[PDB]
RNA sequence: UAUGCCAGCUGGUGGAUUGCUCGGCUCAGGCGCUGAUGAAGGACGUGCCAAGCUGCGAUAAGCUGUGGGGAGCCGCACGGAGGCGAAGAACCACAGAUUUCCGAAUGAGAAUCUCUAACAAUUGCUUCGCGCAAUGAGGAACCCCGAGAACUGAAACAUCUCAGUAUCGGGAGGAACAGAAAACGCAACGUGAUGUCGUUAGUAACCGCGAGUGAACGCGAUACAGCCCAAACCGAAGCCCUCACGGGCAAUGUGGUGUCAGGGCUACCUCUCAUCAGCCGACCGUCUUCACGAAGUCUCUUGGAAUAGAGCGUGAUACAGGGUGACAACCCCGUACUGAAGACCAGUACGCUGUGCGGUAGUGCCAGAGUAGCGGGGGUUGGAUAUCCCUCGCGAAUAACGCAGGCAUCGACUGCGAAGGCUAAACACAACCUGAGACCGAUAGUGAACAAGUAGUGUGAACGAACGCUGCAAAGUACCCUCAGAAGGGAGGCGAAAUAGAGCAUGAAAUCAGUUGGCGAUCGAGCGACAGGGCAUACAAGGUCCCUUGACGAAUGA
RNA sequence: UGUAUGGCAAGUCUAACCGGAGUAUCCGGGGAGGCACAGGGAAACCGACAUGGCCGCAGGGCUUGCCCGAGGGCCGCCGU
């Protein structure tokens, strides 16, 4: 198929062939598996102290005093799991393998599939993204990489009738729960993914919900955050071309 | 760090000289333009305007600046005790704006006027 | 919902009487305990059998059946096409860490082939010569006399 | 509890064809696909070559693999083919998806099931 | 109707629950020795008032210098009094001063004191004098060298296993240890110091051949580095102390040469850039700290308070996180970008000074002994005839020799020189610094969010808790009455709220006081389920229900 | 050792580790090695049906009982 290139003013400036990978049949089950693995693989090992509750010489008196056979120290129960201050019977363990493997082929297929979901306006709309456009992904000239100011990227996005998505992501959510006590108070919608070629867009990165990436290493997660296919993306002329052989 | 416990901790345990930054207030439009700074460390000679509490809108001279509790006393911003005595209502500098500066100190003035440093 | 997930409330978690799941007695001893007594069933009988020759006196032959060679003659375009002529050593994988390459005769030979290897089975020869081909024994192959 | 949405759609399409049209093979192929993956067909070319006949579409209720040689000019229809299988088959005949088979022959006539 | 039963209401009691996090737990990066120049630890002191903690040491919450920092300050700790600071204090960094007693504890003795100059004790050097030096002890674990169980498993148990584990003795470092082949033995026309990681592989090997046990070569990686003696041949050409003088060491050999690319010697060729000694001496990176750092505190409404809703506007290489009277990119700290310093890498790499590599021919000059090896007895190992070690006895050759290649002997072949020594880097731990989290969230998580190894128990070794939350701001309740009264109560005052009033957010259940509805002093006990009646009931969140008659009308059926 | 789902398929998967980067995630590289592709025999050593016959389910075909009949079943034959 064909993809309409846009200059830094938002006007049409020719067009190139949309590479074959964007025709890869959308596979949400494979995309979800790739994201699930990437998410698991960055989780940190944890577990309670191996000796927690065991630092005591507490002994049970056995039969005789009308008491349950429970280890006691200074007239206070200890060690056993049913005892307050006792050990945790089956606690989290550091030794546990919290990683998920994934065949390279299966993962690479998910990358291609997530890439292809990006070329479907309906899917992108179902994912939640706000925009007034028919063609997708949004292809732009390589000059986008030379932009420096965030506001300039804004103007271009408004000129591309795609800025409404950033308006959507411009709302943080103060999460329910104790994640707040561990530094996870906020969360926000995922908006536009900017795929460049030489370096991630420093100018577009701070945009609400935006993620920047490069064609050589863009992954399933940035292409389909949370395992959901069809992220509103904007490739760079060269990025579009590079992504073709992934 | 990004961790909340560590952030609050470093703010509550900061050594005396690091507490000066906890008693900073935004400068008025005129003062910002004049010295090229958005805010300043409120001093006990400055005049300030309350922008947020029950005293919002009132102006007065800063009478005291406590580094430990990171709070300031502004003239007439008070509370009436039971016995009738009038005691100051502690204010957080964040709810205040500096409209006039006490520049009797050569060092403070120099710090304000210099462009490579902020007071 | 998994089996495990449905155990809360069952008391015994599928173990039958609560007197069951205790120590090793419930297994008749730890590991292979009783493999000759109460649990001899389905264990290989006790005893010694045979001998082993030292590992460095053992030879490992890299084999391949004529069927594999023959099924890919056209596909092996990067290998001699005479009046096909293929050196088996250049075909078999794992042919380096092997003491020698041997051609076995499983399958058919639908082409006239000229095979070069260190050894061949009587059946591999009959098949290669039967389809109007030849079998060339390598210099290493000169160990049969 | 199939997980692949495409395999799931194929199965539903196979049923629709067996019901609407006269096809009995499609519904038969649908039932085998609904069964566990371990039971699905895994056929090499040597088997297709041995039991196929020209102008009779070979139907594999699974996947076609590339071992062996195919010389017959047959049309093979499967859920999927390995890269090599599809290459060998197209040299002497034609590799086709079950999705195309259902469209070109909804009545499922002149077909041979091979597993 | 008393005594009383059930449910609720008001108020207690209690501290669950929800929300909150100054603490934990775990992972990761960095970094890493201290002590006779008396450490670590402890004791006792030290403040205006000072009990605890912290700090400090008779100069006692501190003294001095430099740099930073800045108008405030006098630790935790918000009192009273008083004081310090523009003579630039507080505070932070680096460096210095002071630094009681006990403590390895060292003049001697002693439960932290005492008695009449002290390296006690053991050593090296030695001016043979404690003159110059060393050792001792500590440290979270890691590391190296020794000693070495049992419960347990084998469904008993003895070999085996647990296990060279626990525990004990000795000792080093920032890392240890190992290490330049008498190797390997995919047997080769092959590899080429050593650790470590992945694999080889639960393979080979062991084993009441039961249960169990269990490598290596090689390969892919990480990091890479290779050298010095003894002797031959020389023979005082040498070394240490001292400013010097002078002294000490050394023919029982200091020093030169030399170290399997064997060397020495004799005769030659050529040459050095090898090696060794020494000088200089980083970049980058990484860790931590610091400087600078954009943009609203506009309108209306609600509110005690706007960070809320509606409206208008702004920055962004900064929309991580935190604070601020409620949900904050633009109010404050920060955050992106840029820059600076210290530490580590490292006295390393690079560069340089000096030395001089190597080759031919001749020469039986040299080349590590209770050794190699054998036997007796044990331990250990996967090591089986073929692991490594100990002990007692025996015991060789000399490169023209010797050892190894998984039984012994002889020959061949291939590899390799033991009985002297050193050696960077890659790897272990986590005290210390910093960062992180699908970890816990106050009966959890450390024993320990609090006075925590605290209070307290035991002669002692040792054992060992519980206790988090007023409020936006103390505005922490003036005055009056009552009272034995700084109690308490009444009235009153503050605040959005006192049912936020001090172990004070919320405030469950068990349960208690008062009280409401129902039952109740002639009556029977799993306390109820299902039916059906009495009596009782503010709203809300349910709106149905009763009787005449009529329609429909299964089985059944006058 | 099974099972369900998914990728690839006569193959399949990388381990340690290396480079990149948005720096524990992630992208690229790495096939050392493992299992599978031949078995039998203590060992020496030797080394197999890409189909020869008959039944026949599903399915297909036909002129509607008759053919073709993967899989399956019964035999042959082959390696040791
Ligand atoms: Cl064998
Ligand atoms: Cl097959
Ligand atoms: Cl080798
Ligand atoms: Mg606990
Ligand atoms: Mg909750
Ligand atoms: Mg300034
Ligand atoms: Mg290989
Ligand atoms: Mg003494
Ligand atoms: Mg036993
Ligand atoms: Mg037994
Ligand atoms: Mg053992
Ligand atoms: Mg070996
Ligand atoms: Mg020398
Ligand atoms: Mg043993
Ligand atoms: Mg606790
Ligand atoms: Mg006792
Ligand atoms: Mg309360
Ligand atoms: Na304890
Ligand atoms: Na009891
Ligand atoms: Na783990
Ligand atoms: Na069971
Ligand atoms: Na049980
Ligand atoms: Na057993
Ligand atoms: Na028996
Ligand atoms: Na350190
Ligand atoms: Na005190
Ligand atoms: Na001191
Ligand atoms: Na000494
Ligand atoms: Na002396
Ligand atoms: Na037993
Ligand atoms: Na016993
Ligand atoms: Na044994
Ligand atoms: Na090899
Ligand atoms: Na504020
Ligand atoms: Na011996
Ligand atoms: Na050897
Ligand atoms: Na508590
Ligand atoms: Na391989």
From Swiss-Prot, chain A:
Q: Where is this region: Disordered?
A: 37-103
Against SUPFAM superfamilies, the record matches this protein to:
Ribosomal protein L4
One GO MF term: structural constituent of ribosome
A Gene Ontology BP annotation from the UniProt entry: translation
Assigned keywords, A-Z: Ribonucleoprotein, Ribosomal protein, RNA-binding, rRNA-binding
The organism's superkingdom is given as Archaea
Q: Which Pfam families match?
A: Ribosomal_L4
Record keyword Ribonucleoprotein present: yes
Q: Key word rRNA-binding present in the record? A: yes
Compositional bias (Basic and acidic residues): 92-103
Please provide one cellular component term from the Gene Ontology annotations of this protein. ribonucleoprotein complex
InterPro entries reported for this sequence: Ribosomal_uL4 (IPR002136), Ribosomal_uL4_dom_sf (IPR023574), Ribosomal_uL4_euk/arc_CS (IPR013000), Ribosomal_uL4_euk/arch (IPR045240), Ribosomall_uL4-arc (IPR019970)
The job of this chain, per UniProt, is described as: One of the primary rRNA binding proteins, this protein initially binds near the 5'-end of the 23S rRNA. It is important during the early stages of 50S assembly. Makes multiple contacts with different domains of the 23S rRNA in the assembled 50S subunit.
What does the similarity note say?
Belongs to the universal ribosomal protein uL4 family.
- Give the quaternary structure: Part of the 50S ribosomal subunit. Interacts weakly with proteins L18e, L24 and L37e. Has been cross-linked to L18e.
The UniProt entry, under HAMAP family, shows: Ribosomal_uL4_A
Protein name (Swiss-Prot/TrEMBL): Large ribosomal subunit protein uL4
Q: Which organism encodes this protein?
A: Haloarcula marismortui (strain ATCC 43049 / DSM 3752 / JCM 8966 / VKM B-1809) (Halobacterium marismortui)
- Recall the taxonomic lineage recorded for the source organism: Archaea, Methanobacteriati, Methanobacteriota, Stenosarchaea group, Halobacteria
Gene field: rpl4
From Swiss-Prot, chain B:
Alphabetical keyword list: Ribonucleoprotein, Ribosomal protein, RNA-binding, rRNA-binding
| Region annotation Disordered: where it falls in the sequence | 1-25
Q: Name one GO cellular component term.
A: large ribosomal subunit
Q: Which domain of life is it from?
A: Archaea
| Membrane-spanning ranges | none
Q: Which GO terms describe its molecular function?
A: rRNA binding; structural constituent of ribosome
Gene Ontology biological-process annotations: translation
Entries under Pfam families matching the protein: KOW, Ribosomal_L26
Segments of skewed composition (Basic residues): 9-23
Question: Subunit structure of this entry?
Answer: Part of the 50S ribosomal subunit. Interacts weakly with protein L4.
Which family is this sequence assigned to? Belongs to the universal ribosomal protein uL24 family.
Q: What does this protein do?
A: One of two assembly initiator proteins, it binds directly to the 5'-end of the 23S rRNA, where it nucleates assembly of the 50S subunit.
- NCBIfam families recorded for this chain? rplX_A_E
Question: What name goes with this protein?
Answer: Large ribosomal subunit protein uL24
Q: Which organism is it from?
A: Haloarcula marismortui (strain ATCC 43049 / DSM 3752 / JCM 8966 / VKM B-1809) (Halobacterium marismortui)
Curated annotation (Swiss-Prot), chain C:
Report if keyword Cytoplasm is assigned.
no
Subunit structure, briefly? Answer: Part of the 50S ribosomal subunit. Interacts weakly with proteins L18e and L32e.
Q: Which domain of life is it from?
A: Archaea
Provide the function of this protein. Binds to the 23S rRNA.
Q: Which family is it part of?
A: Belongs to the universal ribosomal protein uL15 family.
Name any GO cellular component annotation: cytosolic large ribosomal subunit
Show the ranges annotated as biased composition (Basic and acidic residues).
Answer: 29-46
User: Which stretches of sequence are listed as region Disordered?
Assistant: 1-58
What's the protein here called? Large ribosomal subunit protein uL15
Where is this chain compositionally biased, Basic residues type? 1-28
Q: Tell me one Pfam family matched here.
A: Ribosomal_L27A
Q: GO terms for molecular function, please?
A: rRNA binding; structural constituent of ribosome
List GO BP terms, alphabetically: translation
- Keyword annotations from UniProtKB, A to Z: Ribonucleoprotein, Ribosomal protein, RNA-binding, rRNA-binding
From Swiss-Prot, chain D:
Keyword list (alphabetical) reads:
Ribonucleoprotein, Ribosomal protein, RNA-binding, rRNA-binding
GO BP annotations, alphabetical order: translation
- Molecular functions (GO terms): rRNA binding; structural constituent of ribosome
Q: What GO cellular component entries does it have?
A: cytosolic large ribosomal subunit
InterPro entries per the UniProt record, alphabetical: Ribosomal_eL18 (IPR000039), Ribosomal_eL18/eL18-A/B/_CS (IPR021132), Ribosomal_eL18_arc (IPR022947), Ribosomal_uL15/eL18 (IPR021131), Ribosomal_uL15/eL18_sf (IPR036227), Ribosomal_uL15_CS (IPR001196)
**What family is reported?**
Belongs to the eukaryotic ribosomal protein eL18 family.
Where does this protein come from, organism-wise? Haloarcula marismortui (strain ATCC 43049 / DSM 3752 / JCM 8966 / VKM B-1809) (Halobacterium marismortui)
Query: What protein name applies here?
Result: Large ribosomal subunit protein eL18
